[PDB]
């Protein structure tokens, strides 16, 4: 039961399944995967394509023939298995020389190279069929408040992301940059830190409809926010252009638990919203097998992401199609918060004795929302629990 | 020492010093301020000015005859003291009516009246000079996934906010709205829960200009967030409008502590940003004399909120003005991050063999950022310890 | 299905059911209820029992001949419904008098009072049949460093708790304390804040075997602590009197929401282990139904805190019955780490070279936990989702 | 001025200094550090000591003719400079080998293996005149609930410490335990979370006078804790036996700031309370300078921790020796904080007609406690603004 299948469009990072398990306190657990490994082993999981970092396909520092031959071998993998690279991204963030950041970085060399280091792989990403560029900005922030200016490392991110903007145009290239938020981890505090202050920041870009959001699961709760609400807030900009799936313990450290571990509800109620909407793109998981775990351990933990993706996708199409939920949602006035508030305009409005002079306050504030009984529907729906 | 002065611009809301202390738990400790009081004990303080919501100045369902009468001794006392009105706000959020919010209850007959009650209220702020027109929803949100679709509380809100939009520009009004972030309490999760959401809705309103944000130091802290990153961004974005001065012992209920207390060092690094960016707006705060306290301790509470703020206004410009600090914001390369990364524009970087091939990324990564030192240097400046 | 039985013992506090829904921003929406109508509905519900705090059952003030008037009521109730009262508590927080604490309030005449209205309480307490008396110090603490010396207020505490024990033990009463520790809300910080301070400030008063912990779910959690764990701490120490139940998201205000709502994996997780370790104390809601909701509101959240606990409790029974999760928790050593680490003494283990010197600590690192393995069987079981 | 002494004893970690900068997302960006030359340049600055887990100062898998020279060079440069060594650690977290924990590993094999690497760095501790041997049991916890019976784990962290206390009695050692909590980071939940509950485990040991804690500033800021109220707690049991120092900006990663930066008032109140309580242990940080400096930027890094000490030394003990402070105290009541409520016994409290019948609790209530004008003379006196 709960099998995936390549509708589905589950994908994976490379960096994922091939963590190797090294942590602020602890050495490596696990060896080093060969990206063919991950590969093929996520295709029998039923995964529909993987991702990647340039450095976690290319080693750092790598020469033309080296760097010929691994893109070689990746690409045999995929033809052999027929699993899709629909997101690449950059690492911008393990090497020192990204210790201040890359695109923020005070040192003007740094950012410089940074942006090339970018440009480089967005052509790679391209070869690849990618769809979505992906820029976590893990390094850009501060632990102090002297050492960054964030109005002009602002100025410093929309003229990077504009180049980017401007590269992509120049190239012909269909693909779409995303923006993937983080409040805090590695740096102190990180720049755009949620999914709201990174849709902001695009709409002050250049070319607005190249950039949207990768928001992650875990990010928005470091911050002890509402992830559906979020993802809700980026559907309605028209910004979810991909995202990132797995779980969290609320304010931590970044966990990158499974999908489904961690906030058991909200994983619930960001599948209802997803498949609600219509979400077309990856369903992709940014997590990773703990430590603990051999191999064996780190495919169980993958194919556990996918399998609560399906499980809470049904549970969550049968709530939508239950009768007795649909009429708690008519209880509960969500129709009416569908409908406009005063399409009557605003004349209309200021001559409506009905809205002010003849409201009757109390008997309005009499009215319960039925809210309780709607949730323990949904309760009861999760934990396949009705009757 | 550090006198307030007209020109600092401190502002009160009469509900903060007006808070009579009742909590989750507790019954109010002092009896109902006439606003009369509170604008002439500020006044002594060295306040500048007050704000208001509706009902705190006309008591909610008072007749035309009380409504004149309360503005005319508010009015009086204003003239007597020669304090000033530049912000006012609706309650929105204490009525039984406004348990699921304001303009995004799911009932729009209740929608429809926060309308009109916001818009009389405007009228109202225009009447006593007021430039700002506040907004907090502090009702719009949900305590479960299913009783509130947030794609359609966002069209609601923003069919909300133009329709005030296009009633001030009908009017010729100048005042402006500035939009109150908050991330929770009393809703489970509030909508536009950080500066960064409310900047990006801004951005899809009809008439963007009319709107900004009005940040609360707390709020931000609430979320774990950084509160003078978060007045960065809005200031790059121009969006500024208004400000919320207080203190928050980190990711808790709404503390309203006096400005200065919770985090002190967030609270230096907001002021030097606001006096170096040149904020002109008032400085107004939004806290609460501890239910402890007696009235003494209430005006001993607003006079230390602006005390706490020259103290830091003095300390940061020491810090600014101070060459050896000046010498610490080179070595850590502040006055690069304020250089374009390219102005050459996309061709010449992607022809610069110094931003890749010939880049020696050892030779930067050894680099160090001297970031310690300079943050000891504010450190000292901050405690008048330099020497 | 999920019907509550007498032997469930599901009890509610007056205040949870009662709760007029007065919070920091917003008036009641419903009005008071009679404590006769409370334990009428929540009898037909299926509850077992009712709490109060001595100013839910007698308003505050009351003569003689109204507190026994009050009391007649409530025991006619009880006797008309079976209904039991297990635990009592005091309200030591809403009066203005507690705003700097009861038993640790800087004025000695106040922390004398405090003392005397609890006994006074004890009394009814043990004339109703409770086993346990509650106490949540939830003025206990500071908004400032100044205010309140800890170790003076611990020394104070202690006294108060001692007197309380002497008074018992006086009396010949069976009746036993429970500390419920908070960590915050209302005061800015509350002394005992987790399960561990209250724990450990429990074995330095006089006769430590009279006092236990009450923890609440969403008070452990308001720290980003692991209520489970916590809880398994307390049955370690023997010190698992009484438990109030409820749900939180995360690190907020005190929530309340119904059980299973908040964390609902840390529900599943705390039910295995009440039912796993025995545990026979009531199963007590601490929650409030949403100010959202009228009286029909009311009893449905208050349904789903039973059907909750009952569907959990099926699940996780059937997680611990299960030959392949028993199978799956050997894999991992759980059988391992319930074995003596060193049964054969301290001498021999520090002969034992197979400890040391023999030990192969790569083919030690090497062997896998499976813990991913056995939580995808555990999330299964709480789906429902079993093949 | 601010100039370290030897009385005032700082002291440092090897690992500290020494941090190469390797964090979750990024490789190291210094070379390691010699612990000769750590000894030699803090000894520079005005350190009083070092400590060490047994891993900084002999690699792991060394000979025991290596073990030897490490510990003779080391030796030496303590010779050279003065510096002590009063406290010592086992790494019990790096090494793979302890993924699932080393005293409460399920592996009872693990579990050995730990406790004999300990023994034998107790041993090596002693010789190098320590008094405290620290334990902090990092990766003593679990990612998922199954994984770990946290009672069963209680009871073999019991066995392990209760076999260490029989090893230093047996050999007839002086020195003594101090157990490290922290709430999580690496484990997703980590056993023994705050003070609170170590506090508690220790008096379950079988000779609980060996054991105490060593609390970590920002380890109970990660639970959102007050470390002030913490060491109080701390300090009240008698089981402050050493302390870490550093900063941290709250619910987030364990930042290991350098000490005064973070949660500033914090460090201004803990200092106030080591100082007027007496501590005489070391003062000893556990550390890390940001992985954006340089060696220049360590040791700024490392002296600004002394620096703010000194600093906040300084200001707390001008505050405490002020008469205007004093006076303020008094009208706060804090005197009679520190008198017993009931000196005279539980029945005349019960026959005191003050204490219930004739007390006033409107005039008790009307009393404010003048906790803001304390806290103004403390944030005056912090900063240096008396006037
Ligand atoms: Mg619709
Ligand atoms: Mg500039
Ligand atoms: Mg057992
Ligand atoms: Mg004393
Ligand atoms: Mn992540
Ligand atoms: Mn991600
Ligand atoms: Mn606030
Ligand atoms: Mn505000
Ligand atoms: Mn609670
Ligand atoms: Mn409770
Ligand atoms: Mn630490
Ligand atoms: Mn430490
Ligand atoms: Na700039
Ligand atoms: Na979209
Ligand atoms: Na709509
Ligand atoms: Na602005
Ligand atoms: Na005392
Ligand atoms: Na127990
Ligand atoms: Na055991
Ligand atoms: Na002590």
């Known amino acids: 039961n709960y099998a995936p299948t390549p509708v589905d469009r589950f994908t994976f990072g490379l960096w994922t399944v091939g963590w190797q398990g090294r942590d602020p306190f602890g050495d490596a657990t696990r060896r080093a995967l060969d990206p063919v490994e991950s590969v093929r082993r996520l295709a029998e999981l039923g995964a529909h394509g993987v991702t990647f970092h340039d450095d976690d396909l290319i080693p750092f520092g790598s020469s033309d023939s080296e760097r010929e031959e691994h893109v070689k071998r990746f690409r045999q993998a995929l033809d052999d298995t027929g699993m899709k690279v629909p997101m690449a991204t950059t690492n911008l963030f393990t090497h020192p020389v990204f210790k201040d950041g890359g695109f923020t970085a005070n040192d003007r060399d740094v950012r410089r190279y940074a942006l090339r280091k970018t440009i480089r792989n967005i052509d790679l990403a391209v070869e690849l069929g990618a769809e979505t560029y992906v820029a976590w900005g893990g390094r850009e922030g501060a632990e102090s408040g002297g050492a960054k200016d964030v109005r002009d490392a602002l100025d410093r991110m929309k003229e990077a992301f504009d180049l980017l903007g401007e590269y992509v145009t120049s190239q012909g290239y269909d693909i779409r940059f995303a923006i993937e938020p983080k409040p805090n981890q590695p740096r102190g505090d990180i720049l755009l830190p949620t999914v709201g202050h990174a849709l902001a920041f695009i709409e002050r870009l250049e070319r607005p409809e190249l950039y949207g959001?990768?928001?992650?699961?875990?990010?928005?709760?470091?911050?002890?926010?509402?992830?559906?609400?979020?993802?809700?807030?980026?559907?309605?900009?028209?910004?979810?252009?991909?995202?990132?799936?797995?779980?969290?313990?609320?304010?931590?450290?970044?966990?990158?638990?499974?999908?489904?571990?961690?906030?058991?509800?909200?994983?619930?109620?960001?599948?209802?919203?997803?498949?609600?909407?219509?979400?077309?793109?990856?369903?992709?998981?940014?997590?990773?097998?703990?430590?603990?775990?051999?191999?064996?351990?780190?495919?169980?933990?993958?194919?556990?992401?996918?399998?609560?993706?399906?499980?809470?996708?049904?549970?969550?199409?049968?709530?939508?199609?239950?009768?007795?939920?649909?009429?708690?949602?008519?209880?509960?006035?969500?129709?009416?918060?569908?409908?406009?508030?005063?399409?009557?305009?605003?004349?209309?409005?200021?001559?409506?004795?009905?809205?002010?002079?003849?409201?009757?306050?109390?008997?309005?504030?009499?009215?319960?929302?039925?809210?309780?009984?709607?949730?323990?529907?949904?309760?009861?729906?999760?934990?396949?629990?009705?009757?």
Not at 266 to 282: C, I, N, Q, R, T
Not at 306 to 332: C, G, T, W
Not at 362 to 369: H, K, S
């Open 213 to 387: 959001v990768n928001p992650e699961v875990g990010h928005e709760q470091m911050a002890g926010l509402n992830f559906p609400h979020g993802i809700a807030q980026a559907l309605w900009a028209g910004k979810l252009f991909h995202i990132d799936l797995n779980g969290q313990n609320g304010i931590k450290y970044d966990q990158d638990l499974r999908f489904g571990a961690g906030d058991l509800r909200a994983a619930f109620w960001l599948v209802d919203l997803l498949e609600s909407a219509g979400y077309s793109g990856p369903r992709h998981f940014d997590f990773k097998p703990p430590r603990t775990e051999d191999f064996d351990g780190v495919w169980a933990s993958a194919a556990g992401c996918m399998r609560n993706y399906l499980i809470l996708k049904e549970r969550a199409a049968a709530f939508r199609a239950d009768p007795e939920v649909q009429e708690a949602l008519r209880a509960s006035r969500l129709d009416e918060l569908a409908r406009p508030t005063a399409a009557d305009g605003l004349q209309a409005l200021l001559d409506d004795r009905s809205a002010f002079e003849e409201f009757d306050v109390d008997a309005a504030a009499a009215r319960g929302m039925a809210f309780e009984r709607l949730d323990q529907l949904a309760m009861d729906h999760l934990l396949g629990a009705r009757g």
